[PDB]
Amino acid sequence: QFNPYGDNGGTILGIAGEDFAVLAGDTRNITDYSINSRYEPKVFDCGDNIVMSANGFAADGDALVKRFKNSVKWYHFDHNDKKLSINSAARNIQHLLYGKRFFPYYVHTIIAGLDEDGKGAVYSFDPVGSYEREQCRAGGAAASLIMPFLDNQVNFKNQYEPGTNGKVKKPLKYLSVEEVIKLVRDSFTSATERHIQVGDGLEILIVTKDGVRKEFYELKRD
Amino acid sequence: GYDRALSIFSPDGHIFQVEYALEAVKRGTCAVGVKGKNCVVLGCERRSTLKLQDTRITPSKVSKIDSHVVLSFSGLNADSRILIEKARVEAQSHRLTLEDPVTVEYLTRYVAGVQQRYTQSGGVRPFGVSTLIAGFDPRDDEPKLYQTEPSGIYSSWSAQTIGRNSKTVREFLEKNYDRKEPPATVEECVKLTVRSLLEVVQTGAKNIEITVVKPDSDIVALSSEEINQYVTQIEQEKQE
Amino acid sequence: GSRRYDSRTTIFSPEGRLYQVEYALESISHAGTAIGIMASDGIVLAAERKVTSTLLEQDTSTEKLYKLNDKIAVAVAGLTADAEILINTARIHAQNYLKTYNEDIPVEILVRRLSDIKQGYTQHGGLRPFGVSFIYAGYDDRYGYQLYTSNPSGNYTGWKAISVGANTSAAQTLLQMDYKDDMKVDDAIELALKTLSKTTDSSALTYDRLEFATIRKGANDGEVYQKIFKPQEIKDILVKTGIT
Amino acid sequence: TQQPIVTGTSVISMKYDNGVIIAADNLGSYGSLLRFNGVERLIPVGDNTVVGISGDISDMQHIERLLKDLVTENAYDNPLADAEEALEPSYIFEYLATVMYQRRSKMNPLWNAIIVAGVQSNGDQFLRYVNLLGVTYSSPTLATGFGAHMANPLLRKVVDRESDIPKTTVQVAEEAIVNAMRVLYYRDARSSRNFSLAIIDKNTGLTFKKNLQVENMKWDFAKDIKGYGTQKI
Amino acid sequence: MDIILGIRVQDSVILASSKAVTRGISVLKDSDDKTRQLSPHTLMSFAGEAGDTVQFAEYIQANIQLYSIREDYELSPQAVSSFVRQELAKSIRSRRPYQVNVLIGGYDKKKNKPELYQIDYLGTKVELPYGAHGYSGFYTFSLLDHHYRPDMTTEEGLDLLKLCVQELEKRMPMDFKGVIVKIVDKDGIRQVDDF
Amino acid sequence: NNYDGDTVTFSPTGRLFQVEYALEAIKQGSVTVGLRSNTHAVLVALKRNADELSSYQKKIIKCDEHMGLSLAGLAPDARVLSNYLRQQCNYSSLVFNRKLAVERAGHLLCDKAQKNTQSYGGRPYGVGLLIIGYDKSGAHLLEFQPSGNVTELYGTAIGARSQGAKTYLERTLDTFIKIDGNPDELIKAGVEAISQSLRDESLTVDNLSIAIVGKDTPFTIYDGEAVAKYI
Amino acid sequence: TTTLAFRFQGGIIVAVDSRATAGNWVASQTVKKVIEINPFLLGTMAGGTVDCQFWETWLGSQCRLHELREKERISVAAASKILSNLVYQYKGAGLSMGTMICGYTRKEGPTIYYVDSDGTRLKGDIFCVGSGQTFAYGVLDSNYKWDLSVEDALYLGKRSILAAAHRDAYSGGSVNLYHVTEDGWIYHGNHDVGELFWKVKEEEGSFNNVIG
Amino acid sequence: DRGVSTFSPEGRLFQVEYSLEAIKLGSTAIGIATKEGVVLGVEKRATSPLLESDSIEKIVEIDRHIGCAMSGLTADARSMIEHARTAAVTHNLYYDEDINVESLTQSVCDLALRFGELMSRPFGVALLIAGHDADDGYQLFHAEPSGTFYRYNAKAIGSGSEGAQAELLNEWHSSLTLKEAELLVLKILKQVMEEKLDENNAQLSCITKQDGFKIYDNEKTAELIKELKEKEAAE
Numbered sequence A: 001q002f003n004p005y006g007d008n009g010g011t012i013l014g015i016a017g018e019d020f021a022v023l024a025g026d027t028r029n030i031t032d033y034s035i036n037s038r039y040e041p042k043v044f045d046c047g048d049n050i051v052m053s054a055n056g057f058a059a060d061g062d063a064l065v066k067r068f069k070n071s072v073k074w075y076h077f078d079h080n081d082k083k084l085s086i087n088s089a090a091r092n093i094q095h096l097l098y099g100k101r102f103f104p105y106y107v108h109t110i111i112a113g114l115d116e117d118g119k120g121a122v123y124s125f126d127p128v129g130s131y132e133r134e135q136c137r138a139g140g141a142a143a144s145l146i147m148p149f150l151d152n153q154v155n156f157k158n159q160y161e162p163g164t165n166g167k168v169k170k171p172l173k174y175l176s177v178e179e180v181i182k183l184v185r186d187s188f189t190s191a192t193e194r195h196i197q198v199g200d201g202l203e204i205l206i207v208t209k210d211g212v213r214k215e216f217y218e219l220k221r222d
Numbered sequence B: 001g002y003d004r005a006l007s008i009f010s011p012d013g014h015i016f017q018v019e020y021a022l023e024a025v026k027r028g029t030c031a032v033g034v035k036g037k038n039c040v041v042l043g044c045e046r047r048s049t050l051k052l053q054d055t056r057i058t059p060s061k062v063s064k065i066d067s068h069v070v071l072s073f074s075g076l077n078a079d080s081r082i083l084i085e086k087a088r089v090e091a092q093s094h095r096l097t098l099e100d101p102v103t104v105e106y107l108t109r110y111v112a113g114v115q116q117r118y119t120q121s122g123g124v125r126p127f128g129v130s131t132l133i134a135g136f137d138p139r140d141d142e143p144k145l146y147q148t149e150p151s152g153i154y155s156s157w158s159a160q161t162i163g164r165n166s167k168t169v170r171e172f173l174e175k176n177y178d179r180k181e182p183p184a185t186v187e188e189c190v191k192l193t194v195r196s197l198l199e200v201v202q203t204g205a206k207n208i209e210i211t212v213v214k215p216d217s218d219i220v221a222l223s224s225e226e227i228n229q230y231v232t233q234i235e236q237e238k239q240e
Numbered sequence C: 001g002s003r004r005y006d007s008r009t010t011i012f013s014p015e016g017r018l019y020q021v022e023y024a025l026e027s028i029s030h031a032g033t034a035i036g037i038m039a040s041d042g043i044v045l046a047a048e049r050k051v052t053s054t055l056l057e058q059d060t061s062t063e064k065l066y067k068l069n070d071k072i073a074v075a076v077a078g079l080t081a082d083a084e085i086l087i088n089t090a091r092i093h094a095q096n097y098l099k100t101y102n103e104d105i106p107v108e109i110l111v112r113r114l115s116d117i118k119q120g121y122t123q124h125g126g127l128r129p130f131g132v133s134f135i136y137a138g139y140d141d142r143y144g145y146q147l148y149t150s151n152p153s154g155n156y157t158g159w160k161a162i163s164v165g166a167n168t169s170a171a172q173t174l175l176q177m178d179y180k181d182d183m184k185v186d187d188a189i190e191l192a193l194k195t196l197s198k199t200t201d202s203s204a205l206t207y208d209r210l211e212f213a214t215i216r217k218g219a220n221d222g223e224v225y226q227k228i229f230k231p232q233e234i235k236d237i238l239v240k241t242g243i244t
Numbered sequence D: 001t002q003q004p005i006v007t008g009t010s011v012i013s014m015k016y017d018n019g020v021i022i023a024a025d026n027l028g029s030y031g032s033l034l035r036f037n038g039v040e041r042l043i044p045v046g047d048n049t050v051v052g053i054s055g056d057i058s059d060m061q062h063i064e065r066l067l068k069d070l071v072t073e074n075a076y077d078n079p080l081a082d083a084e085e086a087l088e089p090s091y092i093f094e095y096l097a098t099v100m101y102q103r104r105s106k107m108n109p110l111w112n113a114i115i116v117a118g119v120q121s122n123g124d125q126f127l128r129y130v131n132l133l134g135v136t137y138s139s140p141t142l143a144t145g146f147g148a149h150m151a152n153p154l155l156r157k158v159v160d161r162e163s164d165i166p167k168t169t170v171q172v173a174e175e176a177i178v179n180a181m182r183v184l185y186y187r188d189a190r191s192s193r194n195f196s197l198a199i200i201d202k203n204t205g206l207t208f209k210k211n212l213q214v215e216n217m218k219w220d221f222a223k224d225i226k227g228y229g230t231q232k233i
Numbered sequence E: 001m002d003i004i005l006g007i008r009v010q011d012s013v014i015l016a017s018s019k020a021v022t023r024g025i026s027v028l029k030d031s032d033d034k035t036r037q038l039s040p041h042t043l044m045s046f047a048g049e050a051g052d053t054v055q056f057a058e059y060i061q062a063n064i065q066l067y068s069i070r071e072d073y074e075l076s077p078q079a080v081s082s083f084v085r086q087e088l089a090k091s092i093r094s095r096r097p098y099q100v101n102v103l104i105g106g107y108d109k110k111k112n113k114p115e116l117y118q119i120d121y122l123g124t125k126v127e128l129p130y131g132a133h134g135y136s137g138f139y140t141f142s143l144l145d146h147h148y149r150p151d152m153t154t155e156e157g158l159d160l161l162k163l164c165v166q167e168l169e170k171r172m173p174m175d176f177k178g179v180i181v182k183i184v185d186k187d188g189i190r191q192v193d194d195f
Numbered sequence F: 001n002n003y004d005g006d007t008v009t010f011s012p013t014g015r016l017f018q019v020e021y022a023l024e025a026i027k028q029g030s031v032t033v034g035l036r037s038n039t040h041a042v043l044v045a046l047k048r049n050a051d052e053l054s055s056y057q058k059k060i061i062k063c064d065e066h067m068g069l070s071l072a073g074l075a076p077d078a079r080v081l082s083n084y085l086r087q088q089c090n091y092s093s094l095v096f097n098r099k100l101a102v103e104r105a106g107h108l109l110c111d112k113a114q115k116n117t118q119s120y121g122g123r124p125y126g127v128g129l130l131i132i133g134y135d136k137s138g139a140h141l142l143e144f145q146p147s148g149n150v151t152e153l154y155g156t157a158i159g160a161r162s163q164g165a166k167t168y169l170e171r172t173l174d175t176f177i178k179i180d181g182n183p184d185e186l187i188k189a190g191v192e193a194i195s196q197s198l199r200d201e202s203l204t205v206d207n208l209s210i211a212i213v214g215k216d217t218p219f220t221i222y223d224g225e226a227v228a229k230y231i
Numbered sequence G: 001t002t003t004l005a006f007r008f009q010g011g012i013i014v015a016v017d018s019r020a021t022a023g024n025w026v027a028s029q030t031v032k033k034v035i036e037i038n039p040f041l042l043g044t045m046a047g048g049t050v051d052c053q054f055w056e057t058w059l060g061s062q063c064r065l066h067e068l069r070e071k072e073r074i075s076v077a078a079a080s081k082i083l084s085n086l087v088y089q090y091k092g093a094g095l096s097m098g099t100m101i102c103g104y105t106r107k108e109g110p111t112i113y114y115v116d117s118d119g120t121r122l123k124g125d126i127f128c129v130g131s132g133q134t135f136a137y138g139v140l141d142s143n144y145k146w147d148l149s150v151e152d153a154l155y156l157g158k159r160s161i162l163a164a165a166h167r168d169a170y171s172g173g174s175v176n177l178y179h180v181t182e183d184g185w186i187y188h189g190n191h192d193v194g195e196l197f198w199k200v201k202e203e204e205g206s207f208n209n210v211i212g
Numbered sequence H: 001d002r003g004v005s006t007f008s009p010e011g012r013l014f015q016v017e018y019s020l021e022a023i024k025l026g027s028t029a030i031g032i033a034t035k036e037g038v039v040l041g042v043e044k045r046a047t048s049p050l051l052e053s054d055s056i057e058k059i060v061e062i063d064r065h066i067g068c069a070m071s072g073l074t075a076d077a078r079s080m081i082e083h084a085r086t087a088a089v090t091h092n093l094y095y096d097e098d099i100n101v102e103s104l105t106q107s108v109c110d111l112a113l114r115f116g117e118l119m120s121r122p123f124g125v126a127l128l129i130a131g132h133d134a135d136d137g138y139q140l141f142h143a144e145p146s147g148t149f150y151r152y153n154a155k156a157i158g159s160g161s162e163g164a165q166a167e168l169l170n171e172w173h174s175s176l177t178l179k180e181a182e183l184l185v186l187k188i189l190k191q192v193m194e195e196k197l198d199e200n201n202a203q204l205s206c207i208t209k210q211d212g213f214k215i216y217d218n219e220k221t222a223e224l225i226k227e228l229k230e231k232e233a234a235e
Ligand SMILES: *[C@@](C)(CO)[C@](*)(O)[C@H](Cc1ccccc1)NC(=O)[C@H](Cc1ccc(OC)cc1)NC(=O)[C@H](C)NC(=O)CN1CCOCC1
Pocket: A126, A127, A128, A130, G001, G002, G019, G020, G021, G022, G023, G027, G031, G032, G033, G045, G046, G047, G048, G049, G050, G052, G053, G096, G130, G131, G170, G171
C-alpha cells in the first residue's frame, strides 16, 4: 500500500534574545540510511523579518513554507503593505496547519523574529497547528537530545545559586547573540555525535531590527 | 433556475415591486396593535362580504409563533403563511441552540430579514405583507410591539395599525394614546383597540377579532360575546 | 437574450395585484359550477360537467370530483390537467403523513400544503400559476366535517357552504338564503341540486351533466364513508327531489 | 494507490565545471523479468534540459507527454520561445515537482523518481531531484534507486562539495559516470549493459549519446573461485 | 447513560432513569436527568452513545414542539412514537447512525389512557405494560412478570419500581447513582423528588 | 438604439454598443500616462477627488514585484482585473518558478474581457488599464481596452484629455526611449507628458501619482511628499 | 493534563496544570490551558492541544459575533452549546477534547459546563478533566464544602492540581489559577510546581511518601 | 425592459445611478473625523409619533474599533453589516489582531457590484464607516453601492447632504476637538432636518482609541444639544 509520508531527518533550533532571535538548522537531508544532500537548506527568510522552518517530511515542509510565503504576499496586497507581525504570522500558520487536520503536514514548525515591542520571539507548532511562544525550542529528529540542554543553559533549569542551600534559583537573564550562537554550535555538534540523521552542515539565520543575517558552519559528515 | 431581477430601481430611485407590494398591504383587512402597561392587544378586521363561513376551521388572523410571541398581518394571506412558517421554525431553532426562547425584537428582525431578502433576490417578488409582531421576552414583563413591511424595515411601536383605512385608525390612536400613561389594565387596552377598529369596521359583530397577550406565555383569544360587550359598552357612552 | 420573451408571471401590478392570479381566477369563472355544503351529519359535493356531448362515456368518467384519501375528497373548477398534478401531490402528501405518524392526515394540514404549493408559483420560479380552484370536503377526529376552498393565489378559507367556478355570485346568494346550521345531509343534497338547477347556463339540469358525492358517518358506527354517486344514483336523487 | 508494473532502475548524474551529466540504462523490467530492452529513460526538453526518470514506465510515458505538451504550450503567443522566454530547467522542474506533490496529496502518485539536469540561461548548472512523494533536493551528485547507494559514493569522491565543481572537467566527470554505470551492472539485478548518457554544457550545448555499453569489465578472477568453503575442485 | 425503565399502570406512565454519567474510571455527574418533555403529556427517556443521546432527544423535542405551535394541538403518544421510530429507522442506514435507545411515556387525552412505547436504535417499536433498555431488562422483566398487575395505582407502580431499583442496586456491577422518577398522567408530567 | 440593450447584440453596421458605452466610461475617467525606456517603465496618473474634504481616488495598483497597472474608468472593475492578474502572476511563480511575461499578462486580460462581450447576462468591463512591467525581454508597456484589445507601446495615455499627452509622447518618442539607467529623468518626461492634459488644475502633492519598474527596481508607487520632487 | 473547575459560595475556581506531552516526551512545561474567551468567560483545555486551542479561540469569535448581533453578552449555556454542537458535527472524525466552559451571567449566575469531543455536554458544580483527573478529584472531593472562603477555595484548586501533577506522569509544570465572580474572572498567578511542591510539603506537612 | 448590468450611453451603470437617487431620499447622516476621534450622527426621522424612536437603529457597531452609520433603504444595510462584522471577526481569528478600517470598507464594497443576471439589484443604501487603527489612525469612509469608497475628513449623506456638505466645507479644520465635532454634527443636523432637532429624533455616536465605538445615550446627547443652543446665543 502507498505510504504518502516519509522522514527526511535533520533537526532545527530556535532561540530568542532581548533584541534578536536565531533560527538554526542542519543542512543534511536523508531517507532511511542514505544521504540525499549535504547542503539542502530548510530555514527560510519569509519576509517581514520572519524566518521559518518546517522540519520532518520535506515535501510537506516545503509545501507549508511555500504557502506561508504566499500568505505574507497576499497580506500585503489585501491590507495596504502592512507588516505582518510575528504573532499574526503564528496564528495564520495555525490555520494553514489545521486546514489539513485530517491529513496533516508531517512537520515540526518553528518561526522566529521580533515582536511589536522589538523583543526577540520564537513560536513553535506541532504538526496539526497547536502553537506557543517560547524563549527556546528544538525541533526534529534530535529535538530530544538538544532540548534538555537548552532548558539547562538558556532557562537555567535545575541550577541554583551556590551556597544558598538550593533555595535561591539562578536568575533568568537574556543572552548575547555571541553566547546564543555558542550554544547553537555546541548543541548541533553534540547532536551530530549521537544522532545519525544530523550532520554535514549548520546554517543559522539571525534576526535583528536591521534585517536577516546568515552564518554557516561545517558539521561532521559521517 | 429562474433568475430574473424583478425588484429593481427606477430612474427616480424607487423599487416599484416593493412599493406595489405595499399596495397589496393597503388592500388587506385592517390590523391594529396596542400595548398597555402590562399587556399587548392585537385587533383584526374581518370583512363581512363572506357569510356562510366556518369560523372554527378558517385560518385565524393572529398566529402564535411561539407560546410567548404572536404575529398578525395585513396583505396577501397566502404570503403570510410562508413568513409565519419560517418564523415558527426559527423560534424552535433558537430554543435548540441558545437554550432560550426568542426575544420579540429578534423574531421581528428575522422576519424582516426574510422580507428584505425577497427584495434583492433573483426570480422572486417581494412579500405583499406587513406584520405586527407582539409578545414578551423570556422572564420579562415589559410589553413589546413591532411592525415589519415588504421592504424589510422594522421598528417598535407604542401602538400601530396596518391595512386598509389604517390611516384613519392611526389618526385615532395618535390623539387617544398617551405615551406618559398607557392603558393601565387589560380591559383598558382591549377597549382602546376595539374603539380604534370601530372607526373603520362597520358592525362590531363577527367582524372584529381580539387577541390578548400577557407575560409568561399567557395568550388567549376573545370570543364573540366577550368582544360584543366592548362594542355594546362603547356605543352607549358615545351617545352623549 | 431571453429577457425579451419573459411575461414575468410573478410580479405585482401598480395596484398591488398579481396579474396572473387575477387572470387565472377569470379563467376559473367560466368552468362548470361546483358546490360544497357542510351538514351536521355529513358533507355534500355537487358539480356541473362542462357542456356534455351525448356520445361522452358518462359512467367511466371523472372530471370534477376526485378522491384524495378515504376521508377527504375535492371538487375541481378550472383546468382538469392542472388539478390532476395537484391531486397526485395531495394524495402522496396524505400517505407521507400516514407513514410518519400512523394517523390519517388532518384535513386543514393537507389543504395548507396544497395551498402553499400554489402560493410558490405566484412568488417564484417564473412559471404560470395553476388555473384551479378546489373545494375540499373531508373529515377528521379534531374538527369533524370540514369544507375548504383554495384558489390560484394559494389562499384558502373554511366554509359552511360554498361554490366555485361559474355563477358563484348567484349561487352564493341562494346558498346564503336557504342554509341553516342544524341542517341534515339529505336536506343539503336537495339544496346543492336546487342551487345548480337555478344557476345553470343549461336549459335543464339532467343526470348526465352532473357529478355528485357525499361524505357521511352513515357507515356502521363511528366511521366515515365516501360515496361517489353513479349515473343511475344521480338520476334517482334528481327524481326524488322533483327536479326531473 | 498504485503498484509499479514495468519499471526503470537507477538514474545517475553529477555537476562539472561547465555543466551537468546524466545517465540511465535502457531497460524496462517487469518484476524479475527483464522484459523491454529499447527503453529510453532520458528525455530532452529543448536544447538545455534533460529529464531522467526511474520507476513506473507507464507513468514515465505520461510525464513524457506532459513535457512534450509543455513545450507546445510555451511556444503559443511567444515570439521569444527559442530565446529569452525558452523553457528553463528550473521551470520544467518546478512544474514536475508541483505535479508530483499534488498527485501524492490525492493518494494517487506518479510512481517515479525524477532527476532534472540542465543549464540555466545565465550559465548556472541545474540539477535537482523529485520523487513520488514530492520530496525535492539538490546536490553536486544525484542518483535514484541503487544509484543512490552505489553511484553517489563514487561520484562524491570526484565532487564532494561545491568547491570541487570548478575543479572537475567533463572528461573526468563522464569517466566517473561511465564507471558508476559499470558498477551498477555488476551489482544491480535489474540493470542492463546498454545505456544512454547526456551532457548539457554551457558552451557546447546538449550532447545526447545513445547505445552506449558497459565495457572493460573484470570477470577473469571468477575461474579461481571454487565451491563455498571447503571444496578444492 | 445505562439504566432506563418504564411502567404503565391504570392511570399513568412512570419512567425511571439513572442519574450517573460515567466516562472512563470517573463518575463525572450523579444528578443527570436522562429525559426530555416532548409535549405536555408526552415524556421521552433515553440511553446510549455519548452525545448522540441528548442531540437526538432535543432534535425530536424541537420537532414535536414545532408541530404543536403550527397546529395549536398536541400529538398523541402513538403519533409521537411513530415519528420517533421513523427518525431512528432512517438513522440506522445513514453514514453515522444515532446510537440511542428511548422509552416514550405518554397520556393520550382523547382515549384517557396511559401509553408506554419502547424503541431501540434500529427503530424497533413496541407498546408495552413495562419496558427497559440495556442490561436492566435482564433483571426487571422477570421481576415485573411476577409482580405487575394491569389495574395498579400510581402508588402501587412506584412501589413496584422501588423493587426493581433495589434488585438492580443489588446485582448490577456498576454504581448508577439511583434514579430520577417521573410520572405522566391526565394532569401532565411531574417529578418525584424523594426516591 | 435598438441594438444596445445587451452585449450579445450586433448592430446592423457590425458594432457592439455596450462595448462602446463601456469604452465611454474610460473617456470620463481621470487622465493617466504610461511610457518606457529600455531599462525602466513608468506610470503617471492624475488622481481625482469627490471634493476638498475627500481623499484622491488611487489609480495605480501593484500586481507583482515586476508588474503593475494604472486605471481609468470604473475602479471596481480595475480591482477585479488587477486581482485576476495578481493570481495569474502568482500561479506562474508557484507552479513554474517563473515571472509572468508582460505579454502573456496582456493576452490573459484580453481573453477575460472578451468572454464578457459574447454571453447573455454579463457586461463588458468599464475600465481601461495601462500595464507596465520588467521581465526577461526588458521593459514593457501595455494598453488594455475592455473591448478585449491589448496593445504594446513605447508610450501612451488614456482618460479625459489623454490626446494631449499622447501627442506629446508621439513627438518626444526619440528622446524618452533612450533614457536608460536614469529613473528620475524618465519620470520627469512622464510628468511633463501628463501636464499636456491638464486644464485649470495643476499637479499638486496629493494629486499626482507615479509608479516605476525596471532592471534593478521593483514595482513601487510614489504618493504624497515622495512626488514633491517632480512638481 | 489535569484541569478542574468547581462552583462555591464565592463563585467559581478554575485551576489547570501546564504540561504538554508527546508520548513519554515532555514537549512543554509552560503551556496555557485556560483561554480567556471574554472578561466573564473562561474555557479549559484537555486532550489534543490543537483541537482545544483551535476550536476554543474559534468559540471566542462566535461569542463576539453573538454580542455584536444581539447587543448582549452570550450565556454560558449558549456558548458551551456552540462548542458542543460543533464537535458533534465532527463526531467520529477523531477530534480529542475535554473542555469546561466556565463563566458568570446575570440570568444564570456562576455556571460550569463540561463539553467533550464525543458530544457530551453537562452542567455541574464540580468537574475534573484530563489524564490526572482522578488524582485531582481525590483531593478536591475530600476537602470540598460549599462554604469555602475565596482564600481556601483558591488553595484547594491549587492543591488539587499539585496532587495530580505529582502522581500523574503526564501532568505537571506549573499551576494556573483563576477566580470567576459576578464582576468577571480574576487571574491568580502562575505557580511553578518546582517550588510549590516543597513549599506546600514544608508548610502543610503533607507528601510524606517523598524523601524530604 | 433591459439588462440589470447595462451601461448608459454616458458610460454609467443605470441601476447604480438609480440606487443613488434612492439614497438621496434617505434620512441625513453626518460623520466628522478628528485627531481625538470620529463622530457619527444621524437623523432618525420617525414616520409617526406613535413609533418608539429608540428602536430606530441607523448607527451600528461593526467591531470595537469600527462603527457605521447608514442612509437610504436601511433594510438593505442588514446584510452589509452582517458581512462587515463577520469580516472583522474572521480577520481577528486568522491574524490575532484588529482589522484595518480601510480593509473592512474594501470588503464591504466588494459586495456592492455583486449583482446582475449574486443578488438581483445594487444596494439602495450608502454607509459612513468610521473607525481607528494603529497604522492610519482615525478614519471616516463613505461606501457607495457603486463599489467605490472615499476617505473623508467630514461627510454628509442623505436628503440634506449637499447643503450639509457645503457647511462642513467651511467648518472643518485639522485641529477640531472631539467636543467641537460633536456640537458641529448637531448644529448641521438641526439645519437640514425637517422637524425640530432633539434627543429623540437625532442620535450621536463616536469611536475613540481608548473607549472604542460608543452610541451616546439620549441623556448625554440632550446636554450637548443644550450646550449647542447656549453657545449660538452667546454671540
Ligand atoms: C495532558 C498533558 C495529557 O496529555 C493534557 O491532556 C494535554 C492537554 C493540553 C491542552 C491544551 C494545550 C496543551 C495541552 N494534552 C496534550 O498535551 C496532548 C496529549 C495528546 C496527544 C495526542 C492526542 O491525540 C489522540 C490527544 C492528546 N499532546 C498534544 O496534543 C501534542 C502537543 N501534540 C501531538 O501529539 C501531535 N499529534 C496530535 C494528534 O494529531 C497528530 C499529531
